[PDB]
Write a protein that binds this ligand. Structure first.
Ligand SMILES: CC(C)(C)n1nc(Cc2cccc3ccccc23)c2c(N)ncnc21
Length: 243
């Protein structure tokens, strides 16, 4: 036991959110939190404002891990919902930048987030997106074939995450099954520019999807590129029908 340990008595459950374990909403010290029932020692070293904050942990069966409650659930559910109809490119590039901001912290800390996708991004209020929950379509070849998981395989997945955003939560490589993707991507296939998406944003995706992992961008580059986007790259942006 360490200083992250708390009394299970100090937590009140209220609303169940999901299952799979089970995730609960509730109150701590009479503050609102989320409880994930039955580890995440990785969340102890990591403390960034675009990462879902770990609050506590009950270290005996049944295990309760307590973190900050993100009020809109996954980014995927948030895009497939009533909001994705209104979301345009500035709102999505904003979201992509917060995610890249979190993964650039991960990059500095020399960590790897093996499963990076919109199901694992959590949304709160005012388009706050945070990285959490530390997939052949989202996975880079070197990782899916030879196990070479690097921050550069996460750059690849982030580039796929950029397709999820620009498509309002569509599944990448549409119409293609897993083995069809593996064999296609190996042969050099990359997804084309999504509808109403600037080629400048798709050019960025194609950088994240380079053959050689070392020639891919950093999130430090990615988050800088995305924050400066509507000034340095597309200051000529007019809102289309969907983007
Ligand atoms: C979508 C749904 C599965 C219901 N979900 N999942 C989470 C993750 C999560 C939950 C509880 C504690 C955590 C502690 C550290 C890191 C993440 C934690 C989560 C959350 N914070 N807030 C709201 N919903 C959440």
């Amino acid at each position: 036991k360490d200083a992250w340990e708390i009394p299970r008595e100090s937590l009140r459950l209220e609303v169940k959110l999901g299952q799979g374990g089970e995730v609960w909403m509730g109150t701590w010290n009479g503050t609102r939190v989320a409880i994930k029932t039955l580890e995440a020692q990785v969340m102890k070293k990591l403390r960034h404002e675009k990462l879902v904050q770990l609050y506590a942990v009950v270290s005996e069966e049944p295990i309760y891990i307590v973190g900050e409650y993100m009020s809109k659930g996954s980014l995927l559910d948030f895009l497939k919902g009533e909001m994705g109809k209104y979301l345009r490119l500035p709102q999505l590039v904003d979201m992509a930048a917060q995610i890249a901001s979190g993964m650039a912290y991960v990059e500095r800390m020399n960590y790897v987030h093996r499963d990076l996708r919109a199901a694992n991004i959590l949304v709160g209020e005012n388009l706050v997106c945070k990285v959490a929950d530390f997939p052949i379509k989202w996975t880079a070849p070197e990782a899916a074939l030879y196990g070479r998981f690097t921050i550069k395989s996460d750059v690849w997945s982030f580039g796929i995450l950029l397709t999820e955003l620009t498509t309002k939560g569509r599944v990448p490589y549409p119409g293609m099954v897993n083995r069809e993707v593996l064999d296609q991507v190996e042969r050099g296939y990359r997804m084309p520019c999504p509808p109403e998406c600037p080629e400048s944003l798709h050019d960025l995706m194609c950088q994240c999807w380079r053959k050689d992992p070392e020639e891919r961008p950093t999130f430090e580059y990615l988050q800088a590129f995305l924050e400066d986007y509507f000034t340095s790259t597309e200051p000529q942006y007019q809102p289309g029908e969907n983007l």
